[model samples]
Target chain A: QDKNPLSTFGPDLNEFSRDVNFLTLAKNSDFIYLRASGSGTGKLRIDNKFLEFAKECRRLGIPCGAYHFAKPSKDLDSAVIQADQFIDVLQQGFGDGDYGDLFPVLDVETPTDKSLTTTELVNWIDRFRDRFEEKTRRRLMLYTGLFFIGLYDDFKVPGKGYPLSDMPLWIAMYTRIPSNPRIPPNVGGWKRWTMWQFTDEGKLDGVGSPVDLNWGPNSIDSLMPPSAVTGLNAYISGNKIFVNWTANKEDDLNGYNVFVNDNYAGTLPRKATKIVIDKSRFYLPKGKPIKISIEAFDITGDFSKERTEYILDN
Target chain B: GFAQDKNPLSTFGPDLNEFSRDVNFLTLAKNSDFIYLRASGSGTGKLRIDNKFLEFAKECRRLGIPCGAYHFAKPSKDLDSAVIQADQFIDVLQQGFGDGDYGDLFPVLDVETPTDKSLTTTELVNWIDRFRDRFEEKTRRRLMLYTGLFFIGLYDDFKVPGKGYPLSDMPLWIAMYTRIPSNPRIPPNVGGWKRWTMWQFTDEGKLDGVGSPVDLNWGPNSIDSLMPPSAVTGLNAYISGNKIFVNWTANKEDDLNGYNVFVNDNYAGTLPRKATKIVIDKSRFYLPKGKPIKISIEAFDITGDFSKERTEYILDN
Candidate 1:
């Protein structure tokens, strides 16, 4: 089994059609997510021009989604109203596109209203989610900090929803490892987190300021299935293996996959073209060939093609 | 102090006689371009242009050494007496030598001796000024002062003349010797010093065309010793906005060929043999306005050994 490769969805855009240019450069990106509002006091609003830019991204074969920020208001009704305002604005501008994965993102950071208990805050999110889905017939994707999820244990949110097995969970955990280190083993953790906002200070085109969101590790070959394994090259010099490649594209012509036969190699970032496999990964037999593979990703998420096997005799 | 009769040839006093020796002319000629001989006071007033000294000067001219003379002043309490002594010394040299025969001939003032009735520092400087006024009037050449650093440093009333013949008009000759010839310690604010023309560094120098080893305070000829004074002349000419300039003007007809012009210590390029009128732009040297810059021009002969180097400080506009 192999994981499907993820790509960047949205880039920051203040004004003009800069986000459209960003999506063009990110050809491998499968999704485009943009922030619709931010800064809890509502003093800062996402530029309305992003709707036209999102339409351009859709034309380029990339799925688009909008994220709404949670406002700092004591009344749950007021928070729902703000979410409604975002949906209304998004629909007026980009309603014609298929918005199945579109949802109002509740960006909760240091909840300001002490009057509202943890249950009350969860109920507020639930009400906003329920109202948004009922009106738009689309489930919302929940974006939360890994710390926030554990901080409010008393709150009860739905374990399963309209996104089903593929619910877009934008998890924010600042670590080099792929696993959410903040999640304790005793907690019922999210099995499938769609987007991992690994680094917050990521610079992207179209955004006037730096924006944060989930991005897949850049290596495409690592997402390929195991059965489609082919020839791979690895050279060890001074306790390090330098990996190189040579691929022959067959008629099936799909994306390629590269895998490191190491247990500790984390989830690949979407921008990594090559990785240096160090001594910590494995102890090797002297001057012997190590096994690796390359798989091709078809249009239907299936690995169908394989290349000739190679051996590093030295 | 030793009796004057013991070593009558030795002019240095008894306490200093231990370090003094008879300097050979030939060894001095190889290293020194100018030998400044100070003729001071009637008591030591005997003017003997040593046949060897003239022969050495002639040989220096042949080898391109510039030699000059200075009259050391013995100023009595009377200013008139000091003027009379200066007149006698200049008259003897003028009558004895051919026209322009001596190199850099100027009167020198040595006020080291404190007589029973000594003149003040003002009177001593004034007496030196009288020598310049009288010599320049007769010889049509400017006179220079050759004095020790001790006199310039310790004397309060000898606040180095900064104007007129007592100041800007007179070129100061400071005596500072060092082993490294390149970066010598020059005294500050000694007004109107056109050149540090004389250096007395080593004891084993040749003089009067004789190579007999002598412990005299002078320097020997380094590899780059024989070059003409072109770098100083060219840079000064350029700084003055002079249109036509020739480096090594005296040695232009000699075996010497052109010069290498250095701007800010980097070799820019070379000028032709006897070349003149280097357009300011063509020289490829630009100096900041109103700042002093050191431009050096080194003269090379057919053998490619730079014999002469002159460094000039010029104000750029």
Candidate 2:
């Protein structure tokens, strides 16, 4: 099941590692999500080993991201401070460097304040998520179990607007064999899960101890939208129309989908931002108001939600 | 047949694409007047800096290329999203160099319509205004816009004549590559400005050093006219043994001619581009015995456009 090249597999570590072969781990894993920081005011500092692991990932050319073990509190101010701590750690590790589409994950299995209500908890997470997204442009992923504390089937709060399901889910469900993550019914409006942590007792090559194993859909790029195509311009040359646009900057970008008059015309390579179509190919709606739509897609088969279109009346 | 001397040597520049990481800026620096480097961009909230921006910017600085950083805007529904993206764009520019560093042109906002249809024409206009306003408040400079001939129609339809924000006040960098313009490629008068500050003439521009085709632009005949050389910094003067030593950080403009030294707003003397310091005997000029002299150092480009003077006061004992 893990042999699929399209799907990605990786491990997450919290505190320490003794005798791990980094090169072997890099070869086996598609990406690594390292624990950046922990809960409590005293532990606001970033982990030293995490920085070393991040350096190792960069050295080995393995894409990596950071996840904070969130200490959700009823005091919303704590959420904001903790979020800043996580962001600070991220900056220390990956300052303005592109980490592909691997988003910062909030490990939400633990809660500090025990007498927290559902709405308060949701607001707490929202406060953290808001500050996180405010500092970093990337949205976060939630790492929680199917039956985590404070998160029931009807976990969402009405009128709060920001839903937990708005973020992608990294579900931790223990299972014998590697399988998909199942989102609990109506829990925070999550329709699908992005990643599945099959087990925390999994073993990997060259690692001295067991590690938490994770399986994800395609790569992290699948979870992100290809940058919206911009500057769509087309012109009529002799016997053909030249369609050109600004190429997307996604490293995992596969190609682009071109449509003529809303009909599928052709797929172009990632580098090929311009395409020439024969004037005789389509009916062009009197060849008058010809519409050319260009959609950018990544290697994960995810297409941009928005299409750049240009009209011609020649 | 454009009568303006908008050619490779005088008024041409290139806007780099993703494939331009390997571009030999050293070679392109010879033929180009200026460069526009992609700083950051993408979705409204999920903005990211171009990975190669630092490398390209370093190359530009090394080659003494007058360069501007442009953010490809993707403003989603929320109005604050535009400000957030603009803030990120400012952050990217401030990463290695100051946002308004020497040899820097106006920060550009590439305003092609986004894929999200949530924002209306008015909201889009407001989005641009917010982005521009935030940039202006931070940098105290007007943003240059990069839009198409057709895209400006949105602004025209939403424009309320004399009312609302002065968007037309922003300089226009219009992209109209479909037709070859024998005239000045005059951008539509929908905006208050009838003439374009920069015209992206072609996307198929092939140059020897650049591995792939890049978007080429046509600017005013002199690069300094588009943006004057930034003011010189690190102005300092000290009296030492009957002579006053005046020194300043050298200007970075490639076309920088020299510095015009001024004593109390009166032109004193001219120093060549490479001269960072000039020793003037206390008696060289007509000096009142005990009155302090204000020494100002201002840089000028080849076209004679001058920078704001950085002034230093010399005290007499």
Candidate 3:
């Protein structure tokens, strides 16, 4: 289990892009999982929605990812064809992919063949997995309601772990307040879901997009906290406050979150080694002191310990 | 009541060394057209990067704030010391400020403290000259002096030898702090100043994004004052020929000079300081021949530059 302890959720957008204002979502969401394909129909077939949405999420400083809704069949051939299309669309939705890029997922639901043997279905998913890996270096993900994992039944058929059992799970089971969902029955492999869709009807501050909200793993340990701020000094020069710090030594550091008087002030881009505080933005008192602090955050949202200082005599 | 409706208005930044305890300039662009940026006592031994003057200058440029640069001069023994201070100032500016030029206001020699007040009128000019000239030597930009009318009156006793203008023409950014005494203003009697380029009226000024009181300046846009006057020699004032006669050994200034006769605090009359002695008849003011008198002699250059007072009191006791 990864050590990421975020209980926060983000929405997934489909063609229903009208209700979503990604800018608000960008400021709010932990990681936005965007729908790339539906029932073997790729995002590219209509208005390039997935690419547009992904880039915007990233622009707003949120992590974004792609998901493909599967119409799985009893045949491995059909699943492989569907995966080929899914990988193609994902390949085109690219960037430095450093900010919003996340795992590619396969949304599994609506069993097209209920009578299909578990081995046949597992084999179908196995071929899709092979094709996806062949196209993209990234590991493919499984998005299935946890109960459906039981409905799909027989994850491996034998003690030998099946391909579907090996993938990280994104489980969907709607609720307003969700505990970490149960990991699927031991098909063996990493038997835990990395993310949980906590609610289908979730209300967020900015989005009216009737969005399904999912939580990152209760413990996803892929990120490292940035190094503490050293060589940091905050002093007053005239009526303005200037804060300068030596750059942090973390390779993954993205930027900083500025705080004034223990409240969030603004964000500093990575290239800005110093901040010139505009005095007009805050009410500074005369013959007194004001405190300022900075929090260093990594690309993956892990924050370092804060460093603070004060300016005296106003 | 400062004029915001006027053109060529001068805006001043805070005393950075003191103000750095609370400085930020993100919105300076919208607020000012002329921003006078400062380094800490530039010549003072406490040359600190802590002033953040360079950062403010950069921010001004980055945000499109029209900014000028100034250095506080902590004058040493004489003009030679001003030269060294100027060198330090030019170095810091070149280090990051500019090729010696940038903002709308000239590079100013913030001459507030005159530690060696004992320096004669000529000695002070030499000090200011070396400082400004040496700075110009390196940057090709003329350094303007930022001081008060009283200090200018001390050094600018005669017309500029070369420029032929009164000493008050010394590209002066004069500080007055209102007519408010105990503040910093010239007495009403010290004439010769016709107009000024920048008039600093108060230090308790307000601007958005500036937290502390900033020295506010008004640029009248009439003249560029930047010259010091010559000193007179062989000064002697006595009651000769039944009237107060004043004489000073003539010195070569660019233009012929004049004299201002002062009977104590009263302005007696103005005559050519060009002569050896000028007679001041007691009958002119109908005074009791000479009971007690304090006649002070000051020389003025052709363009209205003034000199220090050379007084001879016949406390005709």
Candidate 4:
């Protein structure tokens, strides 16, 4: 007997949604990625429908991420400029924690200029990646077709495999098997794809036209870090600060990382449920409130998507 | 009683020199109330384990003198370095008496001097706090802060109570040289401590077993003030034939007297100190099918104090 692969059902869409009913669409979706930007003629085309889709997703309480369709230019500067526009859209839509829920995708199919060399194309992608990571302090998930990976195959660097391979991959192939989709070999050096968009002709209850269905090795919730810690309480008694939280019942929980005033304090084991700190542990800036945050992390190194925070005004 | 009564209630001990190649453990144990040995530290990367540190550690356990270990901290600018040294200190402790063993004095963090003297009072305090936090994370116990009057004097923050953390609440082991070894003569207000818990009075003190002058400290007579024997670790239980076997790691507490074994919370037997294994015949107890047999071991010191019990389970088949 074959065990079923773990998956999170979702859809990816652009401005032309085929008159899809988003309310019904959200009911069956675990997550949704709305296209934020792409190439239009010779310039950057911003997806005007992105804000509307984000609002609907938020209303339906669906985990959401934004995607930028690649329109890499021959010059690295213009490629970076495209990243700036995409980042601008992202910042206007979401906060810092939103990007990692379902990692922001860089939809790469074919460049606007087909004559560019493989090195130039790869460099262009690198420019966007560098800019994105530099701005967000998070990695971008690459959404590209099997054939698109061949474009970067010729671009090689010493002492390393594909530079872009380090990013999480969301593979696009037309295979009908959503359970075990056939992915391109090696996947441009990515060991395994994070998400597989198996078929573009799949049916969804909300949309009249065929929808692009997706599958991953995990539910989107598990792909991200554990949820924020609950039952958090922090209080100052005499000269010490005491912190406590209800244990997160995550099976893969590694431990909890504590932060004081946003500075890395230290980690406590999963079994430890409280922290007692003497007032001398940190210097208090005059008139600044003390902030303590605790985040539960998993064995895979994923920290809580949102940290439980407490503030001490005195 | 020719000496009458001089510091009768007070206990005396020596901090072993790092390079002391020869020392009389028997004589030292005879004269001292407890012993403090340098365990690990100096800096990151290279953890300086004193030549005779473990030698003195095992010797103290063998001779039954309450022992505590100190890490000679070489202060660093980065906070993570403190964690690195703390981890190294914990490992060095495990190599000998194991963390939280030997005696009740949590692990000692000797932070009188700094290799890099450029740190501000805040930076230094933060480093010590990080070290203390990491140590507690691993051992679930706090560390005693060791320092001299001059060091805390140079940084008022160390003495200032709770301008940041009430580090004074941490047990203080103050090293202040004095002609008359007494509590009133020691610096009373340093680090916000009402009074020092352990006082290092003289570095030129002479002891019978020591070949050279050894640093001597005055301590409280109560061992519980320092800490009690840690709970037994690595406990295991199994059933074979008609016998049930139980075992655990032997505790390294110096005054450890004996262990009491319990079956299903009922007293089963008592074993002498340093004994790590016990067996009970299954035929002696009612083995209700589908029920679990809870086997527990608790240790007590010569002072009649009991340690937290360690327990394991075996299901009746």
Candidate 5:
């Protein structure tokens, strides 16, 4: 029987030896989001640790990524400096890989005295993206929580030029599996998401903190060794929608299942470019609205948790 | 003329909330003597004394702070409206107190603002007359008028009545915000009348009370006691500058009556009475700089009964 591809959640590495053990665990996770930078007194020095961990994860066939806690600075220049330091350390460890996690996340809303203005925050994000892509040869992916993303609206920071469509997104919205299984509107509206950390209380060996984790689309194949997948997004034009994803291996692909209102709409082959279904069949009647759900099932019937409420249309 | 060494008891006018807190803090300080609970002019819409205010007034009466209720006057457009308002004030006072020994039962008129614009100067005078007439009939006490120095300096129409019920007949309480009380620039028409009993030299007079900060005036000689002056009492004794001073003439005293005193409630040394004076002695009492030391006096009259008193005096360091 083909085992579930995305198995290991995360391996938190506090030191060099922990880094090696984390890499061994990453043989099952599609992608690894590693902590790359921190600031403002008593922050964990994870840059060196991430560098060592990324190097080992690459050697063991797992794609490596880095995240940084977004600290409020005077301007974007300070944030860029911190990001540059993080990339400098990552480049020193693993030069470059086919599927590199270039987008450095900015963790916000944590307790801190320093604060950054809206313009400074956007400038920092732009500079980090530009610098990371120029050096790592990969489009930067943004990792952020729902609260921080909503805060941008209050600060009047325009979300344009944020590269929400071009890169994969790692969204964290923890909810139950079957009931109230609505993916947050912010994540769904983004059109693309690479990883999802659904539950933080998910306990696993070799992890300091319990972490809910994720694996990319095709990286969950039974035969494929642990590796990250790139390009996970859906585009809509009028009535038709286009979905695309790229992974390191696809031998155990069970094809993608399209769902509308928790009911199966249609199934597309593993390599199918797009699947056409009757628009009228999924349409809401009169005042009722239609909610779409999408899922993936392995050949051995190991199903990915139902990604429900993808889109709502009146 | 009284000796320069003589000091008068301090007089304080506090609203309900502050009166209660003042009683507690002054009791601890042991430096308050005479507290005057001003129960009038708290606005017209709802006339009610806070429970704490009544409790503290009762406590002040027990501790010997000659407590009196002052009505906040609302000069209505007509003499009848003004009389009606004064009657409302009397009704509130009757509700606040049962049968008790009220030394000063005068209806105090807190004339701050003129409510009726249409009423002329003569009409305003008649309105005040009506208020005095109605209030005296209800409370059976001479009605007094309290106004700020600014009002007397500005308003020309305020006619000071002479002869029968002279401006002196109804005692005048003048409020002037100053550090010291000297020859105040008394208004022309009201100057000859020498019946000024209460001179509030400062409004920022710190006292125990609730609500807003109130005008603390110089009692008959800046002493701390729980009663007011009357014809039978001959003189009102007050604690001031750590000494027991007797006020024969209410007007002959300095404004800055620097004293600390407290009142004694039922519990021996419980909460002090209002308007008590306190004195400082470094060797006897450990007092920090700037913090006043409250000195309470146990006043023993010719009758041999001990009454609680508070007065403050600077010791010869």
Candidate 6:
């Protein structure tokens, strides 16, 4: 079996949360995505409370990620200012504690253009990303409800696809039992939703109140597998057949899947890197196979192409 | 201790000479703490820019992975060349990526030889000192030294300054691939090398991100090496046979508060600071085989949120 799915769930917080059991939270989730903003206009840091939480999150196993709530003004200059403030506050928050495999999203609820569009969110995002890239530097994503995307019709409004089609998004469309949901194309021409806010009112193991829970695409699969399974070979021991592979440099690699004749057998965690194949489980000339296909998962249940090795009587 | 400490078992990464996979550094940031890359080298092996210099650093920092750097030395050319090499290393680093910026990490000098019939121990030591000094002076970050268990002592070729001054004062990153947790023996000639910053236990590491074989390292970083010991002393926990063994130092901390344990991230049983240990029997939790029954001890204190310091041991049937 693969690792737990909810291993991906996390809570996004603002000042409303004073103190949280970050270690407990990490037990239940992979990361802690917090909110960093200073109220209406972008000035006078309002995230003093977020710093300690971030540090604590880092010390614990939980990686720290963030989002900046926007209150943009019509001028593009205001967007840059907000972006600058967002960068200044949290960049320090994540200073050395950055476990950020997940990028921060730019919250776009703010109404920058009310006339032509109830909110001029796209150019705002573009300018925000531009300033951010100018300073420190493909990582900023967009976050807003599907309704907002529908209201603006910005998803469908396509002139050029630089900022719209390119930037990855973190879409918010809450539902129970949320499996894999496809990214709505009409939303700023986004190609994918790296993160999906599954539900706003869901309760997790640690946090007391109803919190905003998420489903990010981060799996141990975060790292690309170094190479194909090179240590592929087998042996017969007692009444059991032991199959093993010389584990490569599989960083972030949770484990490999053992397949007998292209048929799925079972999965292994990173602990089984150079290892695996239960004796009685397959019982082979059975745990054994004429053709073996080993697939590696970075976690997230996604796999790199399988490396199939055919057994030959040498 | 802060590779999250002990077998919190962080399998981190690096770019010694180099890889060409679809390495999503973003994924690396999420799971691994940091990476060590080959920054510069002497002769045919110098770290000019491949796995690499600024591009790699940019990707790592951009995604939040604290990437550090290392340099390879030939030592056959004498100390002046070492200074030139250091000069070149820092130059390449600063020109494109600000400080060969061992961002939050200490830089390293990979000491090995395919070519050192030229410089003596004194020469090698002088070269190292010059190399380190120049880099440190330019970038305030201290340099770490990487060598195998045998060679560090083997390089004891009669040389005055190298021996008199001793290279052990700076941090040492020993690279020995002899079985780990078992053979952590440091070479004797590592004269005065005060700190053991990183241990390259194996060069046969396979991170999903890199295309080629990479080195695997466990470290007590410059930052972590200086960390005051955890209040939870001698907390040893492991899975042996059918049960999970857990024990710790019992004394209560006056300033810091309580602590607890769980069967699998939960349990009514509260093993506070005063309670020294707990035994977890199998047949209790109906979990998978080989999966470590996560017997956790959560610490509640300040200067931290909640920290769990324990070894993850696998259960056998």
lDDT (tens digit, per residue) of candidate 1 on A103-122: 43555565743556555666
User: B1-317 in candidate 6: lDDT tens per residue?
Assistant: 11212244433555445554456676666656677666666647554544455677677667766677767776654566776777776775554346443443556677786344565666667777667656654454456677776666555632355235445546667776655555444323345443455667777677776656667777652223311113355566777656566766553333232344566644413332223445565555676865555655554321111232433332333
Q: How well does each candidate superpose onto the true structure, as a TM-score?
A: 0.29, 0.39, 0.33, 0.49, 0.31, 0.35
Q: How high a TM-score does candidate 4 get?
A: 0.49
Arrange candidates, best lDDT first.
4, 2, 3, 6, 5, 1
- The runs of at least 3 residues in candidate 6 whose Cα sits more than 4 Å from the true structure, single-residue gaps closed, are A1-7, A42-44, A96-101, A112-119, A156-158, A176-186, A218-314, B1-317
How does candidate 6 fare on TM-score?
0.35
Q: Candidate 4 residues B126-221, lDDT tens each? A: 888778767875665557898987778778747434454446546778877776554345455656565566888888888898888788888765
lDDT of each: 0.45, 0.69, 0.58, 0.70, 0.46, 0.56
True contacts kept of each: 0.00, 0.00, 0.00, 0.00, 0.00, 0.00
Best by TM-score: 4
Return the DockQ of model 5.
Answer: 0.00
Q: Which stretches of candidate 4 lie over 4 Å from their true place?
A: A1-3, A92-101, A112-114, A154-159, A176-184, A222-226, A236-240, A248-256, A268-272, A284-289, A296-307, B1-317
Candidate 2 deviant stretches above 4 angstroms: A1-314, B1-10, B96-103, B115-117, B161-165, B179-188, B230-313
Worst 10 residues of 5 chain A by lDDT: A220-229
Q: State candidate 4's DockQ.
A: 0.01
lDDT string for model 5 (A1-314, tens) is 11145443442232433313554465545556666667644343555576667677777766555666655455566655666666665555556433233234444444323355555665566556545544443345566655555555422445543423333456555665455245645432455454555655655554545555553443434312222333444544455444444422356544455655555454433333233344565544655555555544333222343252345444
lDDT of 5 at A190: 58
Model 6, A20-48: lDDT tens digits are 67768878776667776653654545565
Candidate 2 lDDT over residue span A148-250, tens digit each: 6335435667674435755667877777534533333334566566787877888988577888888887755655657779989999866678787876877
The sequence of per-residue lDDT tens digits that candidate 2 reaches over residues B1-317 is 12222454448889985557458888888988788888888744468878888878877887888887889898766877877888888888876355545236767899887634566667777788778756754553447888876666655534644554346656778777745654235444555554567888778878767877778888875676566567888888887766666778778776565666766655444454544655566665667877887888776543334574455656553
